[PDB]
Amino acid sequence: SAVKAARYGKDNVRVYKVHKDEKTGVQTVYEMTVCVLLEGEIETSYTKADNSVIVATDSIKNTIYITAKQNPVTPPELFGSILGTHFIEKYNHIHAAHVNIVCHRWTRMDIDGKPHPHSFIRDSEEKRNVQVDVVEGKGIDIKSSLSGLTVLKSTNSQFWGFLRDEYTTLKETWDRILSTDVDATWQWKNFSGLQEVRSHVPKFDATWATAREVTLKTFAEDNSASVQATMYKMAEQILARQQLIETVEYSLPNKHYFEIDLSWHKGLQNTGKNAEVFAPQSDPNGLIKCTVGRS
Amino acid sequence: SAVKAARYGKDNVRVYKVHKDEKTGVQTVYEMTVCVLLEGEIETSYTKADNSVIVATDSIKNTIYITAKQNPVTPPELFGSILGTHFIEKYNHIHAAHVNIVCHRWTRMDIDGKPHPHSFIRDSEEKRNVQVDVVEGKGIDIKSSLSGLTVLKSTNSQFWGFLRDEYTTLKETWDRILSTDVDATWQWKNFSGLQEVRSHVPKFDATWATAREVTLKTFAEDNSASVQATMYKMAEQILARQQLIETVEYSLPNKHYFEIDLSWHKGLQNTGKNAEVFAPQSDPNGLIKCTVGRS
Amino acid sequence: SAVKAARYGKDNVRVYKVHKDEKTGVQTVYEMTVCVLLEGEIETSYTKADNSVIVATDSIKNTIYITAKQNPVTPPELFGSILGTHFIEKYNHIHAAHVNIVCHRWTRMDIDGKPHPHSFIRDSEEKRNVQVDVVEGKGIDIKSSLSGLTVLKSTNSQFWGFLRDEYTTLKETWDRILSTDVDATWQWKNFSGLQEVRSHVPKFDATWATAREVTLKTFAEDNSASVQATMYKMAEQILARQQLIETVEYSLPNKHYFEIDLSWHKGLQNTGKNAEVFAPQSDPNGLIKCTVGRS
Amino acid sequence: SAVKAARYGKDNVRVYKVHKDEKTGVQTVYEMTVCVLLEGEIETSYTKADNSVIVATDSIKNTIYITAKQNPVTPPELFGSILGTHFIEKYNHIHAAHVNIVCHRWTRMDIDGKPHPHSFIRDSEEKRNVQVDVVEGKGIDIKSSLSGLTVLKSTNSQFWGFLRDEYTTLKETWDRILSTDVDATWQWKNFSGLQEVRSHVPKFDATWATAREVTLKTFAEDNSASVQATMYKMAEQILARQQLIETVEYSLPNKHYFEIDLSWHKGLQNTGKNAEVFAPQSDPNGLIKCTVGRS
């Protein structure tokens, strides 16, 4: 037997950083959860009990805190690239670093219509994520994403004209509820190294904001023919607005809300045009994915 | 042996309701999770296998949908009271109904600075809850609450002057992070029945909004001497603003963020005034509770 | 305004303890999660910012580890009583301690049919719990419980003869699946203090084992007329086997498995006597409770 | 823009099946959660709103129940292959089916030392899983796995001789607690189609049992030099026992239990050889992976 692939590191490292502006007194907080996994010439730790090749996962944890102390932690694409590059430059036998970062929302509070200098609220479990793979001699590959964005529209969604055979019971509809949790990922063109990542720093926050805005606007305005059709429109717009993205991937659950027939009870009308009360379904759920790239 | 207490019913009943304004085209959605438990002369179902006394839990589920179809579902204090009263009026041998409602946020989306007519976002897992106990011959007791409101302030929290003995290692501090998940409950004076609950309907939403606002403002502005001291100030203000509340209860975790000493690494300074990077702690956590009532 | 009730302390304190038999080489592990909340003359910490009355929650955490170091941690009823008594004896102004303990399963592994000396498996998320309230001048009240015991029987459950009215759609049945997560609590007679708790130590593990065995046997053997009828039989037997228990409480979800009518597809028969494939329902669920005490 | 990849289907479909032996009266239950995603000539549903190519996800759900009605659901490798093959044979434009199955434990109860005919217990959240990819013209690829197997050993684990530099604070140790949640996957050689999968049916349950047994025995008996070294030994043995497996992958968290220094309190000794009470750490955690294949 032989080691075909191996990676190891530290997962679930929670980090908080505060920035204090001495002039204005305004404080800004960042909180993230970080995972770092390494690859390289480490087979002998598995096959021969040779620990000499292991950078201890506890040391990786230390490195994350130290790196956050000495560098900006925003945008996460830059922080992840700094962190990944560190390991391949510092350790001769480590040849790849894989860095995953989940950014948690801490939104500045408005008290009496003005921004508070040092108080924050978690407005939703929506996350902004990055995956950074730093591979020696092959540059830096970055995938950025938003996830946990939960939306619903109560009309202007349709689903008709699908294949009907002996396995089909689903009725066609011209008016339904559509609700989903959005997971959207955009993959950047490969960067040659940290200098190139630094040169594009302004594009990271801007593209995240664009992806979010396009998602919300298209969802709200599209008279949706299907999840498939609507998500494609989203991806197409993002690719058109940022030339440095190669692909956009969406993964969307279709969270069903079922009509409840109440006609058995005193002829009560609660279906079709008369539908007011619905039963949200916890499971099963549709799952629809697509990856859109350039012609 | 004898039955000392018994209650039974349906839990986790998810309900969605939509309201459609025909004039404006504006739609508004409500989504809740409902639990209804009944008490009464039902001992024989336990002791003698006499099912004749059981209103099936499946029927309770049906009743929830039917009631939501025929009545407004907002404010939840009113809907819960209607639902509870139904069971004690309909069934001779049922003498109490306990109704718990969790309201989930569906916040109207703003697209291009204007409110969208039928698209919504889940902005946070914060909930608005009610517990309604309708007891035959004793009226209606309502406890209203908000929960899952997660906040953090990065300074203006202190904790010093606590008891120090041979079990104490905690250092006094004049500047720390304070973060909590707020659970706040206000208990209404007993209402004689549904007519009285209806007469106070405007106070329910208004008091919820006040409780939320007082919580946020006090948290952000108090130079906090302890969780205990700050939460007391919150409760005091709520009681002063709404005479129909008898008690306010807060239950607050103290979610710790620990300094990380980095001085072992090249003398790096990251404690006290130099603290920038912290380690959020998942567990253990302080838990601080208090119930405040009138003199 | 005035403080009507207050309690504070440390929640979610994870503790592991190992016992090493030097003779046999056999090791035994215990793992628990502990919560301790205190009450007493502490109002001024809320109302006057007087921290002098506060035993820091961090010190409570320390005390839990120290107490576990110096005392046995099993049975949990004894450990919780020692821990609670400590606070009321040590601190003049503290007059009640509330201790909750969740014990996690670490079951010794059998390798090649023999018990391994130091390797363990988590066989299920079933927990054994205690709640201990130590109140100065009123002794020690202990509630013991098991929770998270998930069972299913595929036949020998019935449900017919329930009330039928205009809210009822549920069909009577003489053969259904019954599945539940068992939560069972037995409340001990009040103990005068630690000496009395010590004198009954052998009864704690024995009663837990009896409660578990009665639950499983009765569930498996009862031709159940309802959840209500079956749970009553369980509680009755536990009370008969241990005179020092005053009350037994069960709280049981009814986790529904629905028939699936497949007759629309080529006349396929999958209901009543022909039912083979079912759809487990995540929600809603029946919830049935009862407290049984002595005549 | 163009569709580079697309897949869609139904997730979280819960299924229960019962088998009734008419002779013996013995009943056996199976419960699973199933996900089916399809690929094929479906781009136009995304790009042109052409629903004619969509097999509705609701129909996929129906197909899962129908298939479970007409076929055995065990071993899951066979059921998943039947289910995947169905879609590529039934629909001309569908060219791949991806089927994921999670099997939940329902273990027959022993009452008074004998196996009960129709009552079951969920003994742990351990799962047995399969991923089956059926690709038209390329056969059937099956990955089988166990996950959620949580173990701990209290001694006979070491970790010393790792790289030490200016990022390292971790002390070497010759005696520590080792605890992990096992995720192990074995990948079968490609099968040409359903006939070949059927011919190997006995090997599926046997290999699962072997993988489990090797994991447990090696964990309990290895005087572990590291997670890396121990997991390699597991994978090596599995590959040696089943020639039809091509690769074995393990993914293992290192769930840390920290010593607690209590010497500040009356010189209490709780570290090194005197360590009895430890603090389980919820996060961060080591994560160690490896894929082992044949020379």
Ligand SMILES: O=c1[nH]c(=O)c2nn[nH]c2[nH]1
């Ligand atoms: O078994 C281990 N492997 C590792 O790679 C490691 N790093 N810190 N502790 C560790 N333990």
Ligand SMILES: O=c1[nH]c(=O)c2nn[nH]c2[nH]1
């Ligand atoms: O055992 C049951 N008890 C009940 O009260 C009930 N209601 N619906 N189904 C039921 N089953």
Ligand SMILES: O=c1[nH]c(=O)c2nn[nH]c2[nH]1
């Ligand atoms: O605000 C606080 N209250 C307390 O009771 C406490 N105990 N430790 N830290 C603390 N902080």
Ligand SMILES: O=c1[nH]c(=O)c2nn[nH]c2[nH]1
């Ligand atoms: O938008 C949808 N896409 C689908 O593929 C589907 N299948 N059932 N309902 C559906 N809705």
Ligand code: NA
């Ligand atoms: Na390198």
Ligand code: NA
């Ligand atoms: Na009544």
Ligand code: NA
């Ligand atoms: Na006292």
Ligand code: NA
């Ligand atoms: Na095909």
Ligand SMILES: [Xe]
């Ligand atoms: Xe951070």
Ligand SMILES: [Xe]
């Ligand atoms: Xe609702």
Ligand SMILES: [Xe]
């Ligand atoms: Xe413990």
Ligand SMILES: [Xe]
């Ligand atoms: Xe199944």
